[model samples]
Target chain A: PTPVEEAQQKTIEAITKAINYMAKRRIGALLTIERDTGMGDYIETGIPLNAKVSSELLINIFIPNTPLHDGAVIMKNNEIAAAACYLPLSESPFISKELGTRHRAAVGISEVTDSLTIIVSEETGGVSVAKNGDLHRELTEEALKEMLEAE
Target chain B: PTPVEEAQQKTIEAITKAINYMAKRRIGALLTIERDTGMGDYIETGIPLNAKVSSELLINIFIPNTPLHDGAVIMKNNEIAAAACYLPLSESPFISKELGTRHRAAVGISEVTDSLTIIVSEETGGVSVAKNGDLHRELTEEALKEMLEAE
Candidate 1:
């Protein structure tokens, strides 16, 4: 498939922008980006949105007052695949009790699908990205951009 | 993402041919074809092929002397993705004892993923396909063709 050229760059920028906007205000958000996987089942679990990716759109979806804020937004090829999608919860014994559904869901889905899940803490304004059964926590916007654009 | 089309005709033909070849020799084969789901992680569990699918290729993979005979062959976009791939076993209590690893694997992988699994009975020459968490058994070549080609 033809990936949008510079999609990785734009994806990193858009996601970093959203992370800053959400984390600064202590807003919670879960965003999953598909990398070599289709993640069709997870995408089908929520409302389909074949829209372009932008920081503004992501912020809108993650606004807690809206119904779409409850679940996660899945992105593919620098575009949004769905909103409020369901992800499997991780049952691993190692997960910290301090982590909630959003973080667990991020790690759980990452364990199975190889997708990158970004979590913004409404509680502490901390940032986390889960992949390959491991969670990297408290990433800065610069660090996050480097991690995301590396793909 | 949309599914690969009319590829089923070629896929059915290739699989039926391989089924006849393997069943005659009591050789067992497990083949899984992806529809709309991304199977990149499972595909990574085995060797990468990224080749055009063919009956001869499938038979060669299933031959006992070959190293690739042990795991499942995952197909994506109507092409071969990988072989000797481990599949998740089903935990369903209703599975019959008559079904062995191949059958169980067929049902098991189908339970978690939407991929269609074709199982060739090494003991009885029975052919079956599992998809959407359901199993269809005792399929003739004609019936299998119909199911494969059906949208």
Candidate 2:
């Protein structure tokens, strides 16, 4: 139990660092950490990454114009399952039209599964989390950590 | 037990990558992973890392002439405990005079502790490991991995 908890804590910290760094620099990113639901079906997979999650690796994967930068990185069991994985877009047109493909995909994936999605907007340099079809936008670092550890 | 094994396995892979990359490029480095014996007293400690071990972080830490590049990095429980931690030099009268501070430190620490020390040479671009008062030099990638996971 201790090792599992420590490993999970390490993963949460790494994810937090990645999200914060990307958000502060307005580096676009979409990350979906699978929870109870399986993401294999939803993800039209890209590069298979079955590697330990680290802030540097995550940051590099989302670097602008990189091959794996355009789509969501899917994480499972505290390891990156794949990057540049395409998720279904939200069908609801009622959501803000200002929201781009990344945010829409975040909401769309959350709507269909129990997974939580974190989004960093290059346009606004904002941090948002989409869960259970609701987008929690403009979260601070503390808020982000609390939200992540809450599960 | 599974989590602990997986975590250790991940650490071995990370360490291998760090050693391989640094040796290939002639980036000098000294790293000691704490085992049964504690390295707190042996380490004239420097920057407190308390972070997950990653190849990028290790490589950047040992970049030429950087502040933390001059000393050893200490790892415990699969996390980097500190960087730039100074180790005692071997006082042996007859070890090769060609060996430098890094190799001497590696041997010195291994003489007193059960810890394993990995070294990358700037002069020769070679990989070496010191353990149980013996130095294994010029290891291939496979040999290094075998040595690491042998624990």
Candidate 3:
């Protein structure tokens, strides 16, 4: 897979993990994490990711009770220049805001940066992801099992 | 009235106020005011009124002694989250980075949410509105008077 594709896939997995953890805990909160890529000393890309990926990758997430409009998910790096998520709109209302586009974007960041994100939501739950793109959404044992079994 | 219409009216009012103030002071800023239409007072609709609206409403103001793009007058909130202004894009190529589309869109939030935005331009000495169903644009002081006189 291309860099973008590999990053995207990693994000999907990370988000799924985080969501499952939150659901198991039956709690909604914010989470964060950091991963070191050891690549910083090589490049001078001026792009945040180039610098970030070299030294440390950071991901920030906000799981609002209401899903943002126009596919805009709020993602900030160290609370600066937050990127908004733009999602494909779906008609299904059951698509919980807890595990919707924003969640997916949170995971997506991890895939690209190999960074960590602390996921927080008003209703779904919160969990941490690591640099290897591991997602830890829920804290409860049962929830973890369900998440592990989930595709 | 529909929520959209109500929101539009608010935006128009804010624009009118901004223009009128600018015409008087020959200088002014854009300010945003937010009200919560959602439960728990958490959901907020940010409005940008004229700079004279209030310290809290003062989002940004056009700098007096500076090279202006299209002679635009722009101002933003203290946090720089939102702004408002009248932009004569057809006039000059030296677009004021301070008064760009991002700033306008920041003020444009009134159209999407139940918020209000006020934009004033010192160059052409005009004011524009973007709210509710009343999407008036580029009103000079005389035009503003007509609006007030009609009201």
For each candidate, give the interface RMSD after superposing the true interface residues on Cα. Answer: 21.5, 8.4, 17.8
The sequence of per-residue lDDT tens digits that candidate 1 reaches over residues B1-151 is 2344456666678888888777777778898988777778899998555555667556656766445678898888766677778888887777767888888888888987878888888788788898877778888888777777772
What is candidate 2's lDDT per residue for B57-121, written digit by digit as tens?
Answer: 56656777444577888988777777778888888665567888899999999899999999998
Question: Candidate 2: which docking quality band?
Answer: incorrect
lDDT of 3 at A46: 15
**Model 3 ranges with Cα > 4 A deviation:** A1-78, A86-101, A121-123, A128-131, A139-151, B1-151
Q: What residue pairs are clashing in model 2?
A: none
| Residue-wise C-alpha lDDT for candidate 3, range B1-151, written one tens digit per residue | 8986665455446555545655465453443334332111211122121222222122113334321212222322212222223321222233344454523543445444443344555444445544432335566666655553343
Model 2 stretches astray by more than 4 angstroms: B1-151
| The candidate that achieves the highest TM-score relative to the unseen native structure | 2
What overall lDDT goes with each candidate model?
A: 0.79, 0.82, 0.36
User: Candidate 3 DockQ category?
Assistant: incorrect
TM-score of each: 0.49, 0.53, 0.27
Pairs with backbone N, CA or C atoms under 3 Å apart (clashes), candidate 1: A38-B38
Error of 1 at A130 (Å): 0.4
> Could you give the fnat of all candidates in order?
0.00, 0.00, 0.00
User: Using alpha carbons, what is the TM-score of model 1?
Assistant: 0.49
Cα lDDT tens digits, model 2, A1-151, are 6999999999999999988888988999999989998888755465555556777667767777545678888988777777778898987765567989999999999899999999998999899998989888899999999998997
Return the candidate ranking by TM-score, descending. Answer: 2, 1, 3
**lDDT score for candidate 1 against the true structure:** 0.79
